[PDB]
Design a protein around this ligand. Structure first.
Ligand SMILES: COc1cccc(-c2ccc(NC(=O)C3=C(C(=O)O)CCC3)c(F)c2)c1
Lengths: 10, 226
């Protein structure tokens, strides 16, 4: 879930 | 009878819910592109992609969400994605009708059969009869996202504590906006039950698309575990 974590963390 | 703190909650959720877009570029395509299963699915892809970006932005701002365990954060996000998307589609559907017919025709011709598509539109009509205000759609969306019942949640009580205040708020709003129908709140929760049947329905949609050789873009693949 790199992409989802990336969007939640920006 | 919203509390001061409830009214603050409500403003915050409302501010976040309308910090949105149907980007103009996707509207332009809906109303202007060529019409084939191929183009229509590309448009649908863009629409789904926008819904998911919107969902992520809304989710991260929900009070308390940042305090949650980081794997639970993802489990809530993935667990809510289908439900939240179709609720937002229902809101939109129920807001011109030429624009609506053209969009509906695209969705009905985006590479899978009408038995997969009709149930969405019956649901949009069903919830539409309820005449919900924007505040009701926003709180319901928050309640869908902060569900303590989703698969894989490690700390369900922490999520329940964030969901409870929203349900209290929604109950009061139902009495403010529909004072003459005291079953309104109960009806909203009955439509949530209806909404949950889309999880299985969505998975069958994806399966039909993929047998038909359609591919999904990166964000959709991740959110829906394709
Ligand atoms: C590309 O992958 C998939 C897979 C499964 C469902 C969908 C889908 C289905 C329906 C909609 N949208 C709508 O039905 C409607 C509106 C909207 O999204 O804004 C408004 C009217 C109806 C939508 F935006 C996306 C996409």
């Amino acid at each position: 879930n790199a992409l989802l974590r990336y969007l939640l963390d920006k | 009878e919203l509390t001061p703190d409830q009214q603050t909650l409500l403003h915050f959720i409302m501010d976040s819910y309308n910090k949105q877009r149907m980007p103009q570029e996707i509207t332009n395509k809906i109303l202007k592109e060529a019409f084939s299963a191929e183009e229509n699915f590309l448009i649908l892809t863009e629409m789904a992609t926008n819904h998911v970006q919107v969902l992520v932005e809304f989710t991260k701002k929900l009070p308390g969400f940042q305090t949650l365990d980081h794997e639970d954060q993802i489990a809530l996000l993935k667990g809510s994605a289908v439900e939240a998307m179709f609720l937002r589609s229902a809101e939109i559907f129920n807001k011109p009708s030429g624009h609506s017919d053209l969009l509906e025709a695209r969705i009905r011709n985006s590479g899978i059969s009408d038995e997969y598509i009709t149930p969405m539109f019956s649901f949009y009509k069903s919830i539409g009869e309820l005449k919900m205000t924007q505040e009701e759609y926003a709180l319901l969306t928050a309640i869908v996202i902060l569900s303590p019942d989703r698969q894989y949640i490690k700390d369900r009580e922490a999520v329940e504590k964030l969901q409870e205040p929203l349900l209290d708020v929604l109950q009061k709003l139902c009495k403010i906006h529909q004072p003459e129908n005291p079953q309104h709140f109960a009806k909203l929760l009955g439509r949530l039950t209806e909404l949950r049947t889309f999880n299985h329905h969505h998975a069958e949609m994806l399966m039909s698309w993929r047998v038909n050789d359609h591919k999904f873009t990166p964000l959709l693949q991740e959110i829906w575990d394709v």
